[PDB]
Automatic annotation (TrEMBL):
Domain of life according to the entry: Bacteria
Ranges where the Glycosyl hydrolase family 13 catalytic domain occurs: 12-417
Residues annotated to bind Mg(2+) 2: N101, D169, Y203, L204, E206
EC number: 5.4.99.16
One Pfam family recorded for the sequence: Malt_amylase_C
Organism: Thermobaculum terrenum (strain ATCC BAA-798 / CCMEE 7001 / YNP1)
Gene Ontology biological process terms, A to Z: carbohydrate metabolic process
UniProt catalytic activity: D-maltose = alpha,alpha-trehalose
Keywords: Calcium, Isomerase, Metal-binding
Protein name: maltose alpha-D-glucosyltransferase
Binding site residues for Mg(2+) 1: D20, N22, D24, S26, D28
Lineage: Bacteria, Bacillati, Chloroflexota, Chloroflexia, Candidatus Thermobaculales
C-alpha cells in the first residue's frame, strides 16, 4: 500500500513515441490509452510517462514552457485524466516527470525575467555579470555547450544552465521558486498521479567554491518536498534521477525522509562490463561499494532508457573500455556515454538480452522496461542527440511500423530501417504469433516474477564460486528463498556453489517447476550453456511438485 512501488514493474514510454491515434505523425495520449491492453498484457503495473507538457521539444520535452498544460500534439488535460482513470481501472499506476531544476527559455517566467530587472520573475533564474562563477561545476552536455553560463543580451547578464542553453536553471534561493514547484506538485498529485520522477535532482542548488552537485541545501529541499507530499497525499512516491557515485546516490534516500526511490545508476554500467569481461567482479564490486539504504526505500533497476547509456560516473579507464567494447563507431558516442539501444549493444544476442533482463528482474529493486526493448528494438545513431533511441514503437511490418497512418515523411522520427533491426523484422505483431519470441518470453518471465515478491523486497547475499564467469546469489523474504545462478560467458561453464546453509532443500526451477538434486553438504555443481541463467526456489521435501 505505501510501499507499493517495491512490487511494481515499470514501463518507460514517451507519449510522442508510442501510438499516433489521429495520424498527424506524432504519438498522443489517446493513442497511448488505446494501447493499454498491450501494456497490461506485457505485465507492467506502472507506466512512467516521459514529459508531455508544453514545450518547444528541443530536449525531448524536458524543456518545459508551461507546467500546467500538455503539449498540443499530445492532447488535453482531459485526455490525460481519461488516461489516468483508464490505467487505474486496470490496476496500473502512473508516474510523471517533475522537471524541478530548469525551464524552457520560452517559459513565460524567463521571458518576463529577461525583460526588466524589476519584474517579479527576475530572481526566478540564476544571473551573473561574469561567466566564471561556479568554476568547479562540470559541463554535462560537453558535446554542445561551451559553458554553464550563456549571455542574454536583453538581460545584460549571464544566466545559468546545467543543460542546454535554452534550459535556464531555476533559482532555489528564491522562496517563490520553491513555492511554484510545490504548487506544480500539488496540481498533478491532485489529479491522482501516483509518483513523480525528480529530474536532474542533484543540480538544484549551486554554491561557490563547490561543484554544485549534491549540496546539503538540495537534500534539504527534498526532505521538505517529501514532508509536503506525505502531509497532503498518502502513499505517493518520489523517484530521484541521481546519476552519482554510490555514496552520493544513497544520500537521496536521506533516512526515510527524502526520496522513496532512486535509480541504481552505479550497477547499470557494470552489468555491461561484467558481461563483456565474462567475470562477475564489476557487478559484485560496485554493489559492495554501495551503502545500504533506508528500509522503506527502493532502488529502481534499469538496463537502458530514453538517454544515452551514461558513462559519467564510471572511472576513466572503464569509460575507455566501454567505448572500445560497445561503441567502436565514434558516431555511437555522445557526451560521456553511448547512444545505443539494448539489443544493438548486445549484438542482437537473444541469450544475452534474456540474461540481462533476468538480472534486472532478480536483483533487489523495481525493474524498469524501456518501451520497445521487450521486442528487441534497435537504434539510429545518425538521428541526432539521443533521437536514435526514441524512434516510434514498432507495432507491425506495415507502413510506419503500424505507429501511424500519416504521410511517412511527417512522422516525428522515422522507424528503424537498418538491415538487422528493421521494423520489418522487429515488430509486436510478428512476435505475438510465435511462442518463443522475445516478447512472449518477457511476458512469461514477468508473470513468474509477480508470483514472487521476494525479488522486489527480499535481502541478497552473493556467492563466490571459483569460476569467475558465474554470478550466483540468494534472495530471501519471509518464507521464500531463491537461488539465482547465471553464466556471464559466451562459452559453456561449470561451477560449484557452497549451498550448505540450505542442506536438505531442493532447488525447484521456476520456469517449469523441475526439481534439481537435493542440496547436501558437498558443494553443488551447476553446469551452464552459454549465457544460461537459472532461478530456483529452494523448497523442503513437503513442498516438492508433481
Ligand atoms: Mg497524434
Ligand atoms: Mg539548478
Ligand atoms: Mg567476487
Ligand atoms: Mg551467445
Amino acid at each position: 500500500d505505501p510501499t507499493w512501488y517495491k512490487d511494481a514493474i515499470i514501463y518507460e514510454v514517451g507519449v510522442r513515441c508510442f501510438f499516433d491515434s489521429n495520424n498527424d505523425g506524432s504519438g498522443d495520449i489517446p493513442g497511448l490509452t488505446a494501447k493499454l491492453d498491450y501494456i497490461e498484457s506485457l505485465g507492467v503495473t506502472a507506466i512512467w510517462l516521459l514529459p508531455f507538457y508544453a514545450s518547444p521539444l528541443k530536449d525531448g520535452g524536458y524543456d518545459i514552457s508551461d507546467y500546467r498544460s500538455l503539449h498540443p500534439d499530445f492532447g488535453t488535460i482531459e485526455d490525460f485524466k481519461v488516461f489516468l482513470d483508464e490505467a487505474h481501472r486496470r490496476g496500473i499506476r502512473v508516474i510523471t516527470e517533475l522537471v524541478l531544476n530548469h525551464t524552457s527559455d520560452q517559459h513565460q517566467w524567463f521571458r518576463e525575467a529577461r525583460s526588466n530587472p524589476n519584474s517579479p520573475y527576475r530572481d526566478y533564474y540564476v544571473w551573473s555579470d561574469t561567466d566564471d562563477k561556479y568554476k568547479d561545476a562540470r559541463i554535462i552536455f560537453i558535446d554542445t555547450e561551451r559553458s554553464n553560463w550563456t549571455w542574454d543580451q536583453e538581460a545584460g547578464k549571464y544566466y545559468w544552465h546545467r543543460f542546454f542553453s535554452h534550459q535556464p536553471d531555476l533559482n532555489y534561493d528564491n522562496p517563490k521558486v520553491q513555492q511554484e514547484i510545490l504548487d506544480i506538485v500539488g496540481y498533478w498529485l491532485d489529479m491522482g498521479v501516483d509518483g513523480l520522477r525528480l529530474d536532474a535532482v542533484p543540480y538544484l542548488y549551486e554554491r561557490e567554491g563547490t561543484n554544485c552537485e549534491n549540496l546539503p541545501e538540495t537534500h534539504e529541499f527534498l526532505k521538505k518536498l517529501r514532508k509536503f507530499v506525505d502531509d497532503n497525499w498518502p502513499n505517493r512516491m518520489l523517484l530521484a534521477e541521481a546519476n552519482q557515485w554510490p555514496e552520493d546516490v544513497v544520500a537521496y534516500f536521506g533516512n526515510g525522509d527524502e526520496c522513496h526511490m532512486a535509480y541504481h545508476f552505479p550497477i547499470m554500467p557494470r552489468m555491461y562490463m561484467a558481461l563483456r569481461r565474462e567475470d562477475r567482479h564489476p557487478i559484485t564490486e560496485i554493489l559492495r561499494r554501495t551503502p545500504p539504504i533506508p528500509e522503506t526505500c527502493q532502488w529502481a533497476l534499469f538496463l537502458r532508457n530514453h538517454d544515452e547509456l551514461t558513462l559519467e560516473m564510471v572511472t576513466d579507464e572503464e569509460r575507455d573500455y566501454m567505448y572500445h567494447e560497445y561503441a567502436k563507431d565514434p558516431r555511437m558516442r555522445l557526451n560521456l556515454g553511448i547512444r545505443r539501444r539494448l539489443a544493438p549493444l548486445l549484438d542482437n544476442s537473444e541469450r544475452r538480452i534474456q540474461l540481462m533482463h533476468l538480472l534486472l528482474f532478480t536483483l533487489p529493486g523495481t525493474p524498469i522496461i524501456y518501451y520497445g526493448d521487450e521486442i528487441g528494438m534497435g537504434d539510429n545513431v545518425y538521428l541526432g542527440d539521443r533521437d536514435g533511441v526514441r524512434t516510434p514503437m514498432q507495432w507491425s511490418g506495415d507502413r510506419n511500423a503500424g505507429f501511424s497512418r500519416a504521410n511517412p515523411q511527417a512522422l516525428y522520427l522515422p522507424p528503424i530501417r537498418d538491415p538487422v533491426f528493421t521494423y520489418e523484422a522487429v515488430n509486436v505483431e510478428a512476435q505475438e504469433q510465435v511462442p518463443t519470441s522475445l516478447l512472449n518470453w518477457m511476458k512469461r518471465t514477468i508473470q513468474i516474477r509477480k508470483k514472487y515478491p521476494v525479488f522486489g523486497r527480499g535481502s541478497i547475499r552473493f556467492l563466490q564460486p571459483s569460476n569467475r564467469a558465474v554470478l550466483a546469489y540468494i534472495r530471501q523474504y519471509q518464507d521464500t528463498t531463491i537461488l539465482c545462478a547465471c553464466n556471464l560467458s559466451r562459452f559453456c561453464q561449470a561451477a560449484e556453489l557452497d549451498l550448505s546453509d540450505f542442506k536438505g532443500l531442493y532447488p525447484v526451477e521456476l520456469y517449469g517447476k523441475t526439481v534439481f538434486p537435493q542440496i547436501g553438504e558437498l558443494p553443488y555443481l551447476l553446469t551452464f550453456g552459454p549465457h544460461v541463467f537459472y532461478w530456483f526456489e529452494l523448497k523442503p521435501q513437503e513442498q516438492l511438485p508433481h
